[PDB]
Amino acid sequence: VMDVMNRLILAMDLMNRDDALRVTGEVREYIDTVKIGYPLVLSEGMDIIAEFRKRFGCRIIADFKVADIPETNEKICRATFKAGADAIIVHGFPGADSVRACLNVAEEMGREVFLLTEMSHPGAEMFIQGAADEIARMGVDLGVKNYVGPSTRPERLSRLREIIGQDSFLISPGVGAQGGDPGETLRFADAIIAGRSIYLADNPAAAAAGIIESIKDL
Amino acid sequence: MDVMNRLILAMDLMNRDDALRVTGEVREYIDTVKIGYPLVLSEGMDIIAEFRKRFGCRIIADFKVADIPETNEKICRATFKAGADAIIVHGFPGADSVRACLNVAEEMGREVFLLTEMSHPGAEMFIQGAADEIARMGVDLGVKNYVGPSTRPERLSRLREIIGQDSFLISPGVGAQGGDPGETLRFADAIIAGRSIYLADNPAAAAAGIIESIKDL
Numbered sequence: 542v543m544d545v546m547n548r549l550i551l552a553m554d555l556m557n558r559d560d561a562l563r564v565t566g567e568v569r570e571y572i573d574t575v576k577i578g579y580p581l582v583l584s585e586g587m588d589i590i591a592e593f594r595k596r597f598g599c600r601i602i603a604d605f606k607v608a609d610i611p612e613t614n615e616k617i618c619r620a621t622f623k624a625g626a627d628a629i630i631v632h633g634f635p636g637a638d639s640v641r642a643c644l645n646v647a648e649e650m651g652r653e654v655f656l657l658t659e660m661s662h663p664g665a666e667m668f669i670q671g672a673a674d675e676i677a678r679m680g681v682d683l684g685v686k687n688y689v690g691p692s693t694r695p696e697r698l699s700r701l702r703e704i705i706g707q708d709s710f711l712i713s714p715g716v717g718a719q720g721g722d723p724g725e726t727l728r729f730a731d732a733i734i735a736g737r738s739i740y741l742a743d744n745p746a747a748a749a750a751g752i753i754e755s756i757k758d759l
Numbered sequence: 760m761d762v763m764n765r766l767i768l769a770m771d772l773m774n775r776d777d778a779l780r781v782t783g784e785v786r787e788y789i790d791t792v793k794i795g796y797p798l799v800l801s802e803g804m805d806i807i808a809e810f811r812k813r814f815g816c817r818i819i820a821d822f823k824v825a826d827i828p829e830t831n832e833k834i835c836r837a838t839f840k841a842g843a844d845a846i847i848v849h850g851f852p853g854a855d856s857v858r859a860c861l862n863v864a865e866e867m868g869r870e871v872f873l874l875t876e877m878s879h880p881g882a883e884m885f886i887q888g889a890a891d892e893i894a895r896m897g898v899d900l901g902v903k904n905y906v907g908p909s910t911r912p913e914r915l916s917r918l919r920e921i922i923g924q925d926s927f928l929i930s931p932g933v934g935a936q937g938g939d940p941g942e943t944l945r946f947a948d949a950i951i952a953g954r955s956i957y958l959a960d961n962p963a964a965a966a967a968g969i970i971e972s973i974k975d976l
């Protein structure tokens with residue numbers, strides 16, 4: 542599994558190139574794994590992945606929550622890995638064939654797929670939560686090794702960890718701004734994801750250091 | 760919206776030159792183009808403005824938005840800043856995530872299309888069972904534009920029943936995936952066609968053929 546420094550992943554959702562680069566560089570000594578999503582990619586282009594690789598020694602997780610039909614999913618994954626992303630996050634709710642399409646591309650291109658099971662926001666309770674356990678089980682059956690689960694629902698994150706087993710890799714967003722606790726989340730997740738609590742802080746470096754200090758014993 | 764010939768081109772080619780050439784070859788038949796991540800992630804968001812500059816076409820950004828509210832807002836803003844007239848959003852993530860998109864769309868003078876049930880086999884696993892409820896949610900939220908599957912006419916018909924005749928419904932899965940143009944238009948206002956057009960030996964003749972088959976519609 543990827544070795545995430547300090548078990549902390551930066552969710553870089555700033556939409557300005559200059560700000561995104563500044564903040565990421567300021568926390569570089571604390572984080573070596575950055576999650577880049579569509580807010581930044583659709584604002585600055587896929588070349589932003591290339592720029593991050595060039596400027597920082599950071600792994601890149603493309604949080605694109607791939608959720609299309611198999612044929613389109615394959616194209617999205619190909620373009621994303623071609624750009625330099627180490628891994629891509631895919632939704633499981635669209636079904637097994639859609640996930641398999643991503644796994645196949647990742648396999649042939651030498652990259653990784655992260656399967657998003659349950660989400661952290663309130664709306665996730667409407668449809669996603671009820672299908673989450675099965676989505677996770679489907680991932681295990683498909684050979685998925687990396688997963689994404691909600692920090693905002695400890696009980697659910699715990700169950701997801703059980704389903705995927707201790708050997709699987711699990712990252713969890715919702716820490717900070719959404720209310721998730723770093724320490725509690727790390728009881729089940731291999732790494733936590735933090736966005737606003739870091740990039741909107743007056744001193745992003747101090748914010749990252751603070752999070753790490755609170756989980757030093759872990 | 761008034762979609763020429765009730766036919767929307769799904770431009771999923773991943774090369775700027777080919778995407779532009781093919782779209783130009785069928786411009787006389789279509790005035791509405793659906794641009795998704797295959798093209799955008801390969802050529803950049805600037806491709807949207809280029810389409811509006813070269814063609815007199817509406818642009819539907821098929822990004823199947825499926826994040827938390829906060830992120831959905833940012834995605835919609837970036838998408839509309841690029842010139843997209845509408846954006847397609849997943850309903851599965853819940854009402855708050857859809858509302859986030861509706862807010863930005865209202866702010867920038869754009870439309871939100873709610874994707875209920877999908878057209879591929881995998882849609883039967885989780886999406887299909889929640890589709891009717893997702894459509895009802897759209898109705899409760901005031902959504903007026905929807906996306907339903909050409910591959911399952913009975914399901915597409917049910918979606919139409921839920922949203923009513925006033926709502927606008929577009930449907931993918933025609934051609935390559937097996938959907939029939941004419942049958943799909945019994946329920947959808949417009950059909951979406953990708954590969955059956957852009958991968959055909961003669962894209963223009965392909966588009967012309969589809970239109971000829973639905974001439975009476």
Ligand SMILES: O=C1CC(=O)N([C@@H]2O[C@H](COP(=O)(O)O)[C@@H](O)[C@H]2O)C(=O)N1
Pocket residue numbers: 552554578604657659660661662689690691714715716717718719734735736737738826827830
């Ligand atoms: O269930 C999920 C999945 C996910 O990826 N995310 C993402 O994780 C990040 C959370 O950022 P923040 O720490 O709340 O600012 C954002 O990039 C979200 O899009 C989430 O918040 N919940």
Ligand SMILES: O=C1CC(=O)N([C@@H]2O[C@H](COP(=O)(O)O)[C@@H](O)[C@H]2O)C(=O)N1
Pocket residue numbers: 609610613769771795821874876877878879906907908931932933934935936951952953954955
């Ligand atoms: O249920 C759905 C939703 C959707 O947008 N699409 C999209 O519609 C297009 C269908 O293209 P094609 O005609 O099968 O080549 C693609 O861009 C898909 O990503 C789909 O096929 N099924």
